[PDB]
Amino acid sequence: RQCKAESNTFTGICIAKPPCRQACIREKFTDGHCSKVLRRCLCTKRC
């Protein structure tokens, strides 16, 4: 399934998706997106 983990490297509030995604790519995930409410950066990968 699609598994998520908060990014270990992304700092600040998650406004834009692209920075979050880039952080998540750098830590071997497939994507990254901002979370629903708290605007955390979630990295996603098939699991």
3 binds, among a second copy, Cl ion, none (CB under 5 to 8 A by kind): a second copy
Footprint of Cl ion on 15-34 (CB under 5 A): 19
Other C-beta atoms lying within 10 Å of the C-beta of residue 42: 21
The secondary structure element, H or E, covering residue 31 is strand 31-34
Instruction: Between 18 and 47, name the residue whose CB sits nearer to Cl ion.
Output: 18
Other C-beta atoms lying within 10 Å of the C-beta of residue 32: 27
Footprint of a second copy on 8-47 (CB under 8 A): 8, 36-38, 45, 47
Rg (CA), the chain: 9
The contact set with Cl ion (CB under 5 A) reads 10-11, 19
